């Protein structure tokens, strides 16, 4: 078991780090007991009145989509060029 | 006549233009292009000829051509000359240039799609006639069939609209040839205390017998031509004639009739045959790009420009722009085989600027080659 | 006279060819080419090429510059290549209109 996990230790820890950072990014800034103040403030703000998952303007969104399409085309072209110069393909 | 265009449609694109007459000096238009619009002297000019016929390119051929042209032009500052009307291969080339511009994170080098279009072929030209300096003319984008009148391509940044000539109705081709020749005679400043020419190439895709006069005019102006192998029209005629190796009147007329049934006129076919005969007779200014075989447009472009320069002169100062293109495209083998052969004599002072360019741009093979060559 | 025709005759050498579908498709395509240039006459040869996964033969002969292919001419063979899981022919049909 130790050998199997240790082979992929980097990936497992990076997933763990993602989960922990996401968990503490969405937490109120106050630690319990004090978190009661944050809860009361949030409830009051809801009654009286993001870094991730953000919505983009249409022009910027289209520019990003075209940029990613160009990157994908370059990646596929490099893959094709690598395939052509391989030993088996040359043979 | 300097006006800006606000393109309404899919994306808010801006475009400048200048109305010109058939008798205008190409020097004034180049001056306007450089200073009045801020376009730096380009390091490569590719002029798109043909592609306006009803017989369009196959999607694989069209995509390969546009992608290869844009990627070859992305290394340095290149101008792509088209008939800036939203139709045919011009529209797709504009789309590819647009896509590269959106995806480019380096605005230092720019690919500019400059259009040279007839004023009698622009849809809603009176709409853009206003061209107020404070208020750019609003121009709607309309996709239209083959027809006879198109709209300016929104993806072309700059336009050169040429009015019809009362004497002869061929002002557009003459203006294109004059601009290409004037650009080819230009000499931009290079680095420090140096100047370089601007490489000019013509790309032909599915020509019609009508542009043969302009093609021969450009050939006479020592401007190299590049021909798409499977383009569809005159391009197949030219590539087949080169494949045979010999061109005679009988074979020329046979191919011309076979690929163009509609053309049936003794004097006209004789003129076309003679034009083609002279075009092939030049030969050194013509090259074939077969995407099945070559599939690397930068290599073919560099080979064509080097062949034209070799047939032109033997001085090293004339090979400097071809060398710059070779450095930018990492074509060390072509440079060694052709540019740095025994035919051309290279001095140490001639290679200082390209040595700096290879050093700054991380081209160790060219650094080694320049050390090897003096 | 039989040899004088020529375009309608083909040789299958199992030592050299050893793939009967390839030779059959080449013979049928040669006969169709010598017959006519319309794309509607190449539809059955194209169907056989799709069924036999002979993408190279189709590209070399059927989809050359000699024969003009329209988008509506390729709809049925596009469906056949899609349903029968022939991605190479799907790519070829996209490439050809
Ligand atoms: Ca030169
Ligand atoms: Ca048939």
From Swiss-Prot, chain A:
Organism in which the protein naturally occurs: Danio rerio (Zebrafish)
Free-text note regarding domains: Contains two Ca(2+)-binding sites that are allosterically coupled. The binding site in the intracellular domain modulates the voltage dependence and the accessibility of Ca(2+) in the transmembrane domain.
GN (gene name): trpm5
Subunit structure: Homotetramer.
Function: Monovalent cation-selective ion channel activated by intracellular Ca(2+) in a voltage- and temperature-dependent manner. Mediates the transport of Na(+), K(+) and Cs(+) ions equally well. Activated directly by increase in intracellular Ca(2+), but is impermeable to it. The activation mechanism of TRPM5 involves a multistep process.
Stretch of the intact protein here: 972 to 1068 of 1165
Cellular compartments annotated: Cell membrane
Organism domain of life: Eukaryota
Binding site for Ca(2+) 2: 23
Similarity remark: Belongs to the transient receptor (TC 1.A.4) family. LTrpC subfamily. TRPM5 sub-subfamily.
Protein name: Transient receptor potential cation channel subfamily M member 5
